[PDB]
């Protein structure tokens, strides 16, 4: 069960909510089985990571069981001190055990685990996956109205206790405006009992709240459209909420069936409170009082929201019997298009102790004083539409509505005098690809009014804040490019300091205050203290960074935080402003729309500053389709237009913003009949009024008509035809593609019939026979014959059906199918044109042509069916007379407010007959605005486009033959097609000429209209497919550099595209002539050229094509390059057999090359070729260089080759270089031992002594892993690391993570012009020689320190286990029981094959023979990196040359066999010489120069060698050494747990044997059994005397060593001994510990209890053997000791005087002195020493022998004796 298993560990972080702290960059980072990986930092306190992690682990299930996952959540940022903001912890084993093995969207909650009781701080996102032996967890779900609860969708372990509760009270009013939802069927009910009724159907409604999964309901109101509650709800909740959002619905109810929504809204909890604090202890300055910025008791405030109206929007007003085409909106997804009334409430906010839910009635006292905050002033609206393009489908009369909350809907409008709504008109075909608005220099203009609150105190801040973070932006990005212009350090400088002094003097403005302004609310108050705080701060923060010094990048991260700053407190929660809404009809029905911010055209007379971005501003306006989420692959308009809004009081503010003139209009009609029936005609014989209507029935002279106040006549009377089609669409254009229709029509019972007339244009409307089309003067048909268009949605015969024509007569939907039920089919003819230019002064008097003809209609009964063309039947002629009003100059253009309520505001009763306006309104009863231009502006224009880059392919072939559409105002051109590419080059200028645009000439060059660019793929059916488009600027930079610009498609990136564009404004301006002529102001006539000033045109590349200025175009250089792909890492272990047939494909400046197949994943990683070539052109410039990309395919059967990763390189730089290079039985083994060489490199003795007399070699001593010292750069240089990812553009929902990563190298290099030139040596001459090399691996365990203790006794009982790959080796009975710094000295020799199982795990546990072995931490070998070192790092090496002993060569090559490697590896010229001196690259060295100051070295080898070993010493190789480094422990990932001593050693196996390992074995003890005999005692000194008074004394041996009490024994004892006789002969055995290779004497017998080991120490080889009397009926009588040396011992004294103190001595005589380690049988006489303190005194002698035989004859030599 317990069998080592393959497992993946998978992670996924999503979002965080709440994080505590300011200004705040958190990163996640997650770590298990002691491996950590990292998410990428983020910032704010609600970041979104969208980032998966996950983790490779090969171990036993019963070891990643309990194994913890660490998710921490930490604050990293460059200038301040990282900090830990919470943390989250849980095991594998809860993890796995539940379904599917995993936790799918779950919060979990974060706290501090080092700070106690600190509260909850934030929660996080996540979703935890372990995947055991080969399993499966694919589910994903998205359910974000249940995912966002806070019930039952998390877990709380941390600071389970940190919760308080809260009541959120709502008070509900009333609601404005309602739409109709029931049904209108009691319209028809109520008429059976003949009751009076009207169309506006009421509803029932009531409201729902909901919060958290908590909901409360209103009452049901019934019969009403605007609804009064006066209600109460109070909902409990957690202030800690998970949640941002609350909702308030409102439900229509139905008795009968299902209730429907009306509007459905959200209020944010967090744009209503300031949780991130009010005040911070930042104490500024020399002086810090409090050391804070401010003091206060909250420092913060609970979500508020004071009493207002909250706009409701979502689907269409309008009331159908049928199903609704769109009800999503109503339900709060996508965007509201339509106004559906406005509800009126407030909350707030208390903490509580207890939770209930009710709802109440409110007091009459609750209703009567909120009526403060509800007032009403009348505001006005202006609004001007100056274009109308990019039309495309357009069938019928298009018209455009402006509105705002309920006003000028025409639907459901009453009556007014002014129309919200522009008039018809018909489109144009620009002769190129798009319709138009012929709209020309009359342009419509709408004037509306309404009532709504004054909230200008609220909206005034708003607009400043915002002006402040647009003028830094732009400062910022100017900035940001100018670094990459190369500009100069001091003008770099300069602009950072700009930023500074424009914030300052933004923020030094002071803001308005709210405490004049009554009418105020508590959410107000809050924000207005909070925006004062942080504004003081950026002030303060400002300067500074002016005054003080830092890096270029830590200026330019202060301002991008300081940018975000300024946006968060722009916000404003209480808007109870409208939108305005404009939208698109065609016929009469919704086609599009568009909404814009009030705030945004809103204008105060506070200041300038005050004002709307866009008050009296042109916009530019692309409209949208409903129910959409995307930009789409058409747009439905492009329109340009001018808004200003404004209170009634501002009115005479509005005369400054004003263009152009502005007009109303009069009109009457002329009636004549036939005289006398004679042909002549006259006003006489007439039965109608002279002057009329055009109904007939109501008489208007001419002279009755008087200018309303205001106002007055702007000419005099003239005739005005009733349509005026005279136009001109030639601007200024040089080709023309013309098209007809030509219609057939069938029964629909019948068959399909041919008409010989009955061709129309796009609108419907009759035309000319296509046959009978003349080309106009000037012009020259290309195109001999009209042909079938077939790039539309036809069928193969260009025909296109429709179904039996509606009772409208007016078409609609067209398809390509053919049914026998359609009666209709159409096909489309086009003809190319081209102009010929000649004399053009022809067509200057048509320029004067606005009308044709008298203008006269005729008819056979009056006021109906009249014809243009006079008939004989005719009883009946009309014509209509027209007149001009203009504002007075005391008045200017506000006087276009003046006509509502005066055009309307007129009634006479001068009868009882009813009426509307006749007779009291002038003309038209809805007359129109207009604002006429007198003369425009001329423009030219050329695009220059150069290429496109990584274009998406349309198909599985990655082909395709893309063409770009380049589209201006009005006017369009083409590009060339380039065949099967997604790269393509056009190189290709076009050139538009004479575009005229309106406005004031400063105004024109500020706001130019933008260009569009589409990119589309041609193919055989027409360029069905659209590739891609993006929107860019015009310049007026006289020579434009290109620059790229980003293509999107579907909300996707898809490639880039290079080009520049040029715009000349022309001097003469062109000159408009207006119908009711005036006297003209021009005063000056400019007599410019035509085109003589004009720059001169490219050269052309083909006839009619030009090509691109050889200025712009890039200069190019030939360059090679290299690729060194050595092969693929962290791929996963996932399929593996299943995916194991990858191939890389390289590409660079489109060139592509392929690389070889791997068959086996299982066996080799490596590539086999790993040589790459290829030759591209590029740029000079590095801005205009390509990328290098790395694609990762998998080669499977049948010819898939989908891709499965990828990466880029944008620093081909980094890898340049110049093509040019070079050519382009022994007793001295007792104590000289490996042991004491690593002492002496510390400089330590002890265990040395004579050990340093060898004169021998030093090796050098790391205090930390080898790979982290920087001599040798981390030992990581053989190639370089590239990381994949899975990220593609086919789908929005993968990860930006890492999925594997690429080894190899780049090398780019320049090539010669000359192809005579032979190619340079390649850059990389090696083979592939990675295969599966078999090596043998050395490990050393010397010792371990510094270990954490794990059981009571502050010890452990540690062993060494080793794995290498899926091998695994330990020895847990061999080991040192109750140690705290552990010694081994042993060596594991392993064979293993690289790079196959290049990971060595070195693991510690502590030995229990009870219980498990806990882990007490563990290290990680890379051995890949030995084998691959470029340094050499796989053996040891020396300074001093040996053939054999402890300095014996090892390794499996010659020292010159590794100088020739070298020597041919860096490619220089090898050493030469081997005698008495060399010379090598001008240098001569000596040998004489190694050798001086040594000790001859007996076993030095041949000297050929040795002059190899010290040139190789030279260079920058790795020396012999040993090293030691840290442990750790998977459940404390930052904590060492000691360090171990080891090194290792790497010997492939392809050469032949190394020579061996050294024994690195510990020191033991041996007891020998040294010996004492005791031969002659003589002339002892005998102190005590016998009853005879005789001299005597106690004769008996007696000696021992210091803690060997147990080893001791006696002599007996002599009698009589009056001459010191005695003579013993005695064998005495002294079994003491002694090391022989250190030659000391240890102590025996432990005194140790604590632990299973032993005691030992060294001491002083100086013998004391202690002798007193033997008293038998007293206490031992003290007489003296005797003392000898063990190192250092004097040689058996002869005579008398060479028996005394000196010869007791250890070194005072040392000359006389023998060591007893060569000294087997030595007896001799030395002296006693008598007692008396510590003086030195003689009592007598002995004559003993001291010998040392057990270093081999414990007891076969000290015996016979």
């Not at 005879?1588 to 060593?1601: A, R």
Request: glycine letters at 6%; one cysteine or more; hydrophobic letters at 35%.
């Amino acid at each position: 069960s317990d069998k080592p298993q393959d497992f993946q560990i998978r992670v996924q972080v999503i979002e965080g909510r709440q994080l505590p702290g300011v200004n705040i960059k958190p990163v996640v980072k997650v770590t298990a089985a002691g491996q950590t990986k990292r998410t990428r930092i983020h910032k704010g306190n609600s970041p979104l990571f969208n980032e998966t992690l996950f983790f490779n682990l090969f171990d036993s299930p019963g070891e990643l069981f309990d194994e913890p996952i660490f998710i921490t959540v930490v604050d990293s940022r460059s200038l301040r001190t990282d900090a830990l903001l919470g943390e989250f912890r849980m095991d594998v084993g809860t993890i796995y055990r539940e379904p599917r093995h995993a936790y799918l969207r779950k919060w979990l909650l974060l706290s501090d685990p080092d700070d106690f009781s600190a509260g909850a701080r934030g929660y996080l996102k996540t979703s935890l996956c372990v995947l055991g032996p080969g399993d499966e967890a694919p589910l994903e779900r998205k359910d974000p109205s249940e995912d966002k609860e806070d019930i039952e969708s998390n877990l709380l372990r941390p600071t389970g206790v940190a919760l308080r509760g809260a009541h959120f009270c709502l008070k509900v009013f009333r609601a404005e405006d309602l739409p109709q939802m029931d049904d209108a069927v009691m319209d028809n009910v109520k008429q059976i009992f003949g009751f009076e009724s009207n169309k506006k159907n009421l509803v029932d409604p009531f409201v729902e709240v909901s919060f958290a999964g908590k909901m409360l309901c209103s009452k049901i109101l019934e019969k009403t459209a605007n609804p009064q509650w006066n209600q109460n709800i109070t909902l409990p909740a957690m202030f800690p909420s998970m949640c941002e959002k609350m909702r308030i619905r409102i439900i229509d109810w139905d008795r009968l069936t299902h209730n429907d929504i009306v509007a459905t809204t959200y209020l944010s909890m967090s744009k209503i409170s300031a949780p991130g604090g009010e005040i911070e202890e930042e104490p500024a300055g020399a002086v810090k009082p409090s050391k804070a910025s401010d003091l206060d008791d909250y420092l913060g405030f609970l979500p508020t929201f004071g009493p207002c109206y909250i706009n409701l929007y979502g689907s269409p007003r309008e009331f159908t019997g049928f199903p609704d085409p769109y009800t999503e909106l109503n339900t709060g997804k996508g965007e509201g298009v339509a106004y559906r009334g406005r509800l009126l409430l407030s909350l707030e906010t208390k903490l509580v102790e207890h939770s209930e839910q009710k709802v109440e009635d409110l007091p009459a006292d609750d209703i009567l004083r909120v009526e403060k905050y509800l007032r009403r002033r009348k505001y006005s609206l202006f609004a001007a539409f100056y274009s109308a393009t990019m039309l495309q489908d357009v069938d019928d009369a298009i018209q455009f509505e402006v509105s705002i909350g309920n006003y000028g809907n025409k639907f459901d409008m009453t009556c007014l005098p002014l129309a919200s709504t522009t008039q018809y008109s018909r489109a144009v075909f620009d002769g190129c690809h798009y319709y138009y608005l012929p709209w020309g220099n009359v342009k419509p203009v709408v004037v509306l009014s309404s009532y709504w609150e004054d909230i200008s105190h609220r909206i005034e801040t708003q607009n400043q804040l915002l002006g402040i973070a647009d003028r830094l932006e732009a400062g910022l990005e100017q900035v940001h490019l100018a670094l990459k212009a190369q500009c100069s350090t001091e003008d770099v400088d300069s602009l950072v300091a700009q930023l500074t002094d424009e914030l300052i003097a933004g923020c030094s403005q002071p803001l308005g205050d709210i405490h004049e302004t009554p009418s105020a609310t508590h959410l107000d108050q809050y924000l207005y203290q909070l925006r004062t705080h942080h504004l003081s701060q950026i002030t303060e923060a400002a300067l500074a960074l002016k005054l003080g010094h830092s890096e270029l990048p830590a200026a330019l991260e202060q301002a991008e935080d300081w940018l975000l700053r300024l946006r968060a407190l722009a916000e404003e929660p209480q808007n109870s402003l409208p939108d305005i809404v404009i939208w698109m009809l065609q016929g009469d029905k919704r086609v599009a729309y568009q909404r814009v911010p009030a705030h945004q055209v809103l204008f105060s007379r506070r200041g300038a500053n005050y004002c709307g971005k866009n008050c009296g501003k042109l916009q530019t306006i692309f409209l949208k389709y409903p129910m959409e989420k995307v930009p789409g692959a058409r747009m439905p308009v492009q329109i340009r237009v001018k808004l200003w809004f404004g209170l009634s009081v501002d009115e005479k503010e509005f005369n400054q913003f004003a263009e152009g003139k502005l007009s109303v209009f009069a009109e009457t009609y002329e009636n004549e009949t036939k005289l006398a029936l004679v042909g002549n005609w006259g006003t006489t014989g007439l039965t109608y009024p002279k002057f009329s209507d055009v109904t007939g029935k109501i008489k208007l002279p001419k002279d009755s008509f008087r200018p309303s106040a205001g106002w007055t006549w702007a000419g005099d009377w003239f005739v005005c035809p009733e349509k005026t089609l005279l136009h001109d669409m030639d601007a200024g254009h040089l080709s023309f593609v013309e098209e007809v229709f030509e219609n057939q029509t069938r029964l629909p019972g019948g068959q399909w019939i041919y008409m010989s007339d009955n061709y129309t244009d796009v609108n419907g409307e009759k035309v000319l026979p296509k046959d009978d089309i003349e080309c106009p003067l000037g012009w020259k048909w290309e195109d001999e014959e009209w042909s079938t268009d077939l790039n539309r949605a036809v069928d193969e015969q260009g025909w296109e059906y429709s179904i039996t024509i509606p009772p409208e007569r007016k078409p609609k939907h067209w398809v390509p199918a053919e049914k026998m039920y359609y009666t209709h089919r159409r096909r489309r003819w086009v003809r190319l044109r081209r102009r010929d230019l000649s004399q053009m002064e022809a067509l200057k008097r048509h320029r004067q042509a606005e009308a044709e003809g008298e203008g006269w209609e005729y008819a056979s009964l009056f006021g109906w069916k009249f014809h243009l063309e006079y008939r004989k039947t005719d009883a009946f002629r009309r014509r209509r007379w027209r007149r001009r009003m203009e504002p007075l100059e005391k008045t200017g253009p506000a006087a276009v407010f003046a006509l509502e309520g005066a055009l309307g505001g007129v009634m006479d009763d001068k009868s009882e007959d009813s009426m509307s306006v006749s007779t009291l309104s002038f003309g038209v009863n809805r007359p129109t605005i207009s604002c006429i231009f007198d003369y425009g502006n001329r423009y030219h224009l050329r695009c220059y486009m150069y290429q496109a880059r990584d274009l998406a392919a349309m198909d599985k072939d990655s082909f395709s033959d893309p063409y770009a559409i380049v589209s201006f105002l009005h006017q369009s051109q083409k590009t060339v097609v380039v065949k099967n590419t997604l790269n393509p080059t056009w190189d290709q200028t076009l050139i538009f000429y004479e575009i005229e645009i309106f406005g004031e000439p400063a105004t024109v060059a500020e706001q130019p209209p933008s260009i569009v660019v589409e990119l589309y793929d041609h193919d055989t059916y027409g360029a069905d497919e659209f590739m891609g488009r993006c929107i860019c600027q015009p310049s007026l930079e006289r020579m434009p550099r290109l620059a790229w610009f980003p293509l999107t498609r579907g909300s996707q990136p898809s490639g880039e595209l290079l080009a520049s564009f040029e715009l000349i404004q022309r001097e003469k301006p062109a000159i408009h002539h207006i119908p009711g002529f005036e006297v003209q102001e021009t005063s000056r006539i400019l007599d410019e050229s035509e085109d003589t000033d004009l720059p001169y045109p490219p050269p052309q590349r083909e006839a009619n094509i030009y090509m691109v200025p050889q200025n712009i175009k890039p200069a190019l250089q030939r360059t090679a390059i290299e690729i060194l792909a050595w092969g693929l890492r962290n791929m996963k272990s996932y399929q593996l057999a299943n995916i194991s047939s990858p191939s890389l494909v390289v590409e660079c400046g489109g060139q592509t090359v392929q690389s070889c197949v791997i068959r086996n994943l299982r066996k080799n990683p490596n590539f086999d070729i790993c040589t790459l070539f290829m030759e591209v052109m590029l740029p000079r410039e590095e801005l205009y260089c390509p990328p290098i990309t790395v694609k990762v395919i998998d080669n499977r059967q049948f010819g898939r080759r989908p891709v499965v990763g990828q990466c880029t390189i944008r620093s081909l730089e980094s890898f340049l270089c110049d093509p040019y290079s070079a050519e382009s039985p022994i007793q001295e083994e007792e104590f000289i031992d490996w042991w004491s060489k690593f002492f002496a490199s510390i400089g330590e003795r002890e265990k040395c002594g004579s050990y340093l007399e060898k004169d021998f070699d030093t090796l050098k001593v790391y205090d930390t892993q080898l790979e982290n010292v920087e001599a040798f750069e981390g030992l990581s240089d053989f190639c370089n690391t590239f990381k994949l990812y899975r990220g593609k553009t086919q789908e929005e929902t993968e990860d930006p993570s890492v999925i594997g990563e690429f080894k190899g190298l780049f090398k780019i290099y320049p090539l010669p012009e000359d192809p005579a030139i032979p190619m340079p040596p390649r850059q990389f001459h090696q083979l592939a020689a990675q295969g599966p090399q078999e090596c043998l691996v050395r490990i050393y365990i010397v010792r371990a320190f510094g270990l954490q203790p794990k059981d009571p006794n502050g010890k452990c009982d540690p062993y060494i286990k080793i794995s290498i790959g899926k091998k695994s080796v330990s020895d847990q009975d061999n080991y040192i029981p109750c140690t705290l710094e552990p010694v081994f000295g042993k060596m594991f020799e392993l064979t293993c094959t690289l790079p196959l199982e290049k990971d060595l795990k070195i693991t510690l546990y502590d030995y229990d023979l009870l219980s498990k072995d806990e882990k007490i931490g563990e290290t990680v070998v890379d051995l890949e990196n030995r084998l691959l070192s470029k340094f050499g790092a796989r053996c040891g090496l020396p300074q001093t040359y040996c053939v054999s002993g402890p300095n014996q060569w090892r390794d499996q090559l010659r020292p010159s066999q590794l100088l020739h490697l070298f020597c041919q590896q860096h490619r220089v010229k090898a050493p030469v010489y081997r005698t008495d001196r060399v010379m090598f690259q001008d240098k001569e060295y000596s040998i004489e120069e190694i050798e001086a100051g040594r000790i001859p070295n007996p076993h030095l080898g041949p000297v050929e060698e040795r002059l190899a070993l010290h040139v190789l010493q030279q260079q920058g190789l790795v020396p012999e050494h040993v090293e030691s480094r840290p442990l750790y422990s998977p459940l404390q990932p930052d904590i060492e747990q000691g360090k171990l001593q080891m090194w290792v050693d790497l010997f492939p196996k392809a050469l032949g044997r190394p020579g061996p390992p050294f024994n690195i074995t510990p020191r033991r003890a041996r007891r020998f059994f040294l010996r004492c005999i005791i031969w002659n005692t003589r002339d002892v000194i005998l102190d005590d005397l016998s009853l005879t008074g005789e001299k005597m004394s106690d004769i008996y041996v007696k000696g021992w060593m210091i803690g060997f009490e147990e080893h001791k024994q006696k002599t007996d004892v002599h009698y009589r001994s009056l001459g010191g006789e005695g003579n013993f002969n005695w064998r005495f055995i002294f079994p003491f510990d002694y090391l022989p290779a250190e030659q000391v004497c240890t102590i025996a017998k432990k005194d140790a209890f604590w632990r299973l080991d032993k005691t030992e120490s060294k001491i002083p080889a100086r013998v004391v053997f202690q002798i007193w009397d033997n008293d038998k009926f007293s206490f031992d009588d003290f007489l003296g000791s005797l003392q000898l040396d063990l190192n250092r011992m004097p040689k058996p004294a002869k005579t008398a005087k060479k028996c005394s103190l000196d010869q007791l001595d250890d070194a005072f005589h040392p000359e006389w002195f023998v060591s007893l380690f060569e000294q087997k049988t030595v007896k001799g006489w030395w002296p006693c020493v008598a007692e008396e303190g510590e003086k030195k005194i003689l009592a007598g002698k002995l004559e003993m022998t001291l010998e040392i035989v057990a270093e081999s004859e414990h007891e076969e030599r000290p015996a016979g004796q």
